[PDB]
């Protein structure tokens, strides 16, 4: 019941087109999608993922200007990030879920929760797919560091 780890490079769709608010659709196309580059540490206890974003064209460097790394941590069957307090055209908390498919790639969502419309969720479906192993030029931060 311990995950597959997160090892190389992923690209992560955040299907915006699939937008809802309160579970009510608010389409807002198009899809995003970006490249990052995963590692994966697993302690006897826990299961924690790194990930810096590669640039939109070339997926051999790191993104520039530098993207400060984001966490996942693996938890009741999904990959989830640390919740993070984001300015909203109001104060929101947003997170991203990745559930492990069998099949191999990951399916989940980010979640937006409003706190200041002070209080609606905001989900929009995402998808991540391994695109081979790590670019060999970029550095990820160990999550056990």
């Known amino acids: 019941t311990a995950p597959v780890p997160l090892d190389g490079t992923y690209r992560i769709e955040i299907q915006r087109?699939?937008?809802?608010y309160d579970y009510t659709?608010?389409?807002?196309?198009?899809?995003v999608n970006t490249w990052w580059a995963f590692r994966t540490s697993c302690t006897p206890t826990?299961?924690?993922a790194a990930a810096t974003m590669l640039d939109?064209?070339?997926?051999?460097?790191?993104?520039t200007p530098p993207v400060r790394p984001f966490l996942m941590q693996f938890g009741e069957g999904?990959?989830?990030?640390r919740p993070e307090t984001?300015?909203?055209p109001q104060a929101t908390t947003?997170?991203?879920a990745l559930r492990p498919q069998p099949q191999g790639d990951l399916v989940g969502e980010m979640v937006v929760t409003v706190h200041?419309?002070?209080?609606?969720?905001?989900?929009?479906?995402?998808?991540?797919?391994?695109?081979?192993?790590?670019?060999?030029?970029?550095?990820?931060?160990?999550?056990?560091?």
């Open 86 to 88: 984001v300015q909203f």
């Open 94 to 96: 947003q997170l991203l």
């Open 56 to 63: 939109d064209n070339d997926h051999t460097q790191a993104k």
């Open 17 to 20: 087109s699939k937008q809802t």
């Open 46 to 48: 826990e299961c924690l």
């Open 116 to 145: 200041s419309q002070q209080g609606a969720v905001i989900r929009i479906p995402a998808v991540a797919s391994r695109s081979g192993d790590l670019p060999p030029a970029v550095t990820v931060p160990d999550p056990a560091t």
């Open 25 to 31: 659709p608010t389409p807002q196309p198009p899809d």
């Open 78 to 81: 999904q990959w989830k990030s």
